[PDB]
């Protein structure tokens, strides 16, 4: 079977301008497990990202947490970009600063 990823973007702690923090890109509910995830700062790929182990839910769909250390500022825009066999083109979700 094939399953399309869900993508959420949120910070680990409440963001404050100029304060170090972590930004998460949580990708879930997908199958097969091959997946490509980049975190972006003003449209540019962030190198220093890590991820938790690829794991899976009771319905056997996979999930994956990507995250990166970041220091948000008023002007900076962050995003998560995901490609998967189920998608025509990469899907970009923007960090919404806790305002959905």
């Amino acid at each position: 079977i094939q399953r399309t990823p869900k993508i959420q973007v949120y910070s680990r702690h409440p963001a404050e301008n100029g304060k170090s923090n972590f930004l998460n890109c949580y990708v879930s509910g997908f199958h097969p497990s091959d997946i490509e995830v980049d975190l972006l700062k003003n449209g540019e790929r962030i190198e220093k990202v890590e991820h938790s182990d690829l794991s899976f839910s009771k319905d056997w769909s996979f999930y994956l947490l990507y995250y990166t250390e970041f220091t948000p500022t008023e002007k900076d825009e962050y995003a998560c970009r995901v490609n998967h066999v189920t998608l025509s083109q990469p899907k970009i979700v923007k960090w919404d600063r806790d305002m959905h």
């Binding site: 959420q8 949120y10 680990r12 972590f22 998460n24 949580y26 879930s28 890590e50 938790s52 947490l65 995250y67």
Partner: peptide, 8 residues
């Protein structure tokens, strides 16, 4: 409407 996810 809610959502939920892990931190590292």
């Amino acid at each position: 409407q809610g959502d939920f996810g892990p931190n590292s």
